[PDB]
Design a binder for this molecule. Structure first.
Ligand code: NAG
Lengths: 99, 43
């Protein structure tokens, strides 16, 4: 590495960012400002990057101390745990039907 | 990543593992990156 080396031979500093979801709490988060929670209404929700649309209601499910979100047979999120409140919320898809 | 699941249960038996079924729930996930091929116990 001499300063007169061709750009193809000049030194370049490289940084590689790899993102990881583990079997553990998500602790790295973006700067996006959080908002208050609304229940029993159709909303566009983003829980820790888990995005979707539906109605958030109080659940009677029993997540284990680690479980963050549930799923349905379709592989869709059926319920979640609020990152700011240790409560479990059921997601009901917004009412729809043929016209 | 070293994942550690565990389960505690009362027993009354002095011979060997009681027969039955019970699931172990995860408790720890250590981001060690330490390669492992052997282990040992300490009593
Ligand atoms: C942050 O969230 C936790 C949830 O476990 C809560 O206990 C705590 O009061 C919250 N802090 C603030 C400043 O809202």
């Amino acid at each position: 590495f001499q300063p007169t080396n061709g750009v193809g031979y000049q030194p370049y500093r490289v940084v590689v960012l790899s993102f990881e979801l583990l079997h553990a709490p998500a602790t790295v988060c973006g700067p996006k400002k959080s908002t208050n929670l609304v229940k029993n209404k159709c909303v566009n929700f983003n829980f820790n990057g888990l995005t979707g649309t539906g109605v958030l209601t109080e659940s009677n499910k029993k997540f284990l101390p680690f479980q963050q979100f549930g799923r349905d047979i379709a592989d869709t999120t059926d319920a979640v745990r609020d990152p700011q409140t240790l409560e479990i919320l059921d997601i009901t898809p917004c009412s729809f039907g043929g016209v | 990543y070293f994942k550690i699941y565990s389960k505690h249960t009362p027993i009354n038996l002095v011979r060997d593992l009681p027969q039955g079924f019970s699931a172990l729930e995860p408790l720890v996930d250590l981001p060690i990156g330490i390669n492992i091929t052997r282990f040992q116990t300490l009593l």
